[PDB]
């Protein structure tokens, strides 16, 4: 008790709100202009909008926990409660934008992602900073999925910066905000490991204390001590298709046991080779075009014994991220060295100290005008 009739209440009024929100959002504009007129408060039905989307994503996954096989919950939610509200007369608000967010909650959860084209196609509307922080949250995942870390890092540094003036402050994020920030820590830690030396992007979001933390963390993973491969994914296992968090752990039932084995077995595949490619590249770019003596003299740490040293290093040299080369009778082992500076980070941070003063002005200046 204190679980199941609540599950019913939530999911019944979810699919009932899906009914009268799908039907009166397609052709007519009567409800539209009456919800404009009567409640000028443009708030409580941007609240309904997001709150129910979050508890829907959670509670249908709470029903999935029991109905693993031939399970109605995710089908009836994902098709009619998400994709019928998707195909809609694009309303003049953050309603149509939140419908495609509300389904992308499930479309990231269940990992059949490559109409990422259509997710950013259908909205020709103003992605509100409150909503575009969620877009970064949503799309950044789809580009760590596509085996492109070097430009998927471009998505997460800006949201853990939270630089785009985020405040609401009407129970709207909602009720799970610092856990969202903690998942944003997982994603920036993820895009730091196999990339450093390359960024030049663990400056802005992650700062010196928990930067050197995730430094010592990711570099001991890079050294080949997999305590951090272990810890990162041990505390990131549900974080890719979690409900919001599962209901209640007991002893007996096998149904509950399947979806957590499901989230283990399929995305443990992703992280095994993440830490492999990290440890393959780990070691520094010491010398440029090494002679075959210096090639083997560096494979003394990198990979020897003995035979098949050179040809397993070929397996380490064909990655799209390892520019090497072997000239035969010249006997020249060519290798690249991709560097970056640091002092070039003061171009829009300087505009941000300007807007930070203007922000320090805002709250106190309306106080002044209201008091006056």
């Amino acid at each position: 008790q204190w679980l199941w009739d609540i599950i019913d209440e939530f999911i019944y009024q979810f699919q009932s709100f899906s009914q009268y929100r799908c039907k009166t959002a397609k052709k007519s504009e009567e409800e539209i202009d009456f919800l404009r007129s009567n409640p000028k408060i443009w708030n409580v039905h941007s609240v309904l909008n997001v709150l129910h989307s979050l508890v829907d994503k959670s509670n249908i996954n709470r029903q999935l926990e029991v109905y693993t096989s031939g399970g109605d919950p995710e089908s009836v939610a994902g098709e009619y409660g998400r994709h019928s509200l998707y195909k809609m007369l694009g309303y003049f608000s953050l309603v149509g934008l939140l419908r495609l967010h509300s389904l992308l909650g499930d479309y990231y959860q269940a990992i059949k992602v490559l109409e990422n084209i259509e997710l950013n196609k259908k909205s020709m509307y103003s992605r509100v900073p409150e909503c575009q922080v969620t877009t970064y949250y949503y799309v950044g995942f789809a580009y760590l999925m596509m085996r492109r870390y070097q430009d998927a890092i471009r998505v997460f540094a800006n949201i853990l910066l939270y630089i785009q003036r985020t405040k609401s402050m009407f129970q709207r994020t909602t009720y799970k905000y610092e856990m969202i920030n903690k998942q944003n820590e997982q994603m920036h830690a993820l895009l730091a490991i196999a990339l450093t030396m390359y960024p030049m992007r663990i400056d802005e979001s992650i700062h010196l204390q928990l930067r050197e933390k995730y430094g010592d963390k990711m570099l001991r993973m890079q050294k080949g001590d997999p305590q951090v491969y272990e810890e990162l994914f041990s505390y990131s296992c549900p974080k890719f298709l979690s409900p919001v968090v599962p209901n209640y752990d007991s002893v007996h039932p096998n149904y509950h046991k399947e979806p957590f084995l499901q989230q283990l077995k399929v995305f443990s595949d992703e992280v095994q080779q993440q830490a492999q490619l990290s440890t393959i590249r780990s070691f520094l770019k010491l010398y440029t075009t090494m002679p075959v003596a210096k090639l083997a003299g560096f494979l003394d740490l990198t990979e020897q014994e003995f035979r098949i040293q050179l040809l397993v290093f070929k397996h380490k040299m064909k990655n799209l991220v390892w520019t090497s080369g072997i000239s035969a009778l010249d006997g020249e082992f060519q290798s690249a060295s991709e560097v970056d500076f640091y002092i070039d980070k003061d171009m829009i941070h300087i505009a941000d100290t300007k807007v930070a003063r203007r922000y320090g002005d805002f709250f106190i200046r309306q106080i002044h005008k209201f008091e006056e």
Binding site: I350, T353, K354, R357, G360, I364
Partner: protein, 91 residues
Amino acid sequence: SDLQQVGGASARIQDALSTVLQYAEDVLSGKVSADNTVGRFLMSLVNQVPKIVPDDFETMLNSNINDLLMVTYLANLTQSQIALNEKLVNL
């Protein structure tokens, strides 16, 4: 902004002046009052702007581009440090 407009206006006087005193001697007998008067003052333009073509001095400047950014950054941060510190008086 406007003393750079008149700095450009000076540079218009140069080009319109230098072109005609050239093309006058392309025709016949120009660069008379412009042989080693403006010819000396073309040399006087380039005496102190620009410097010959020294890329070592361009690096000196490119580090100048770093230190003004800093002078300018310190500048707009102490703008923030006005309301930041000085006005939590304002609560």
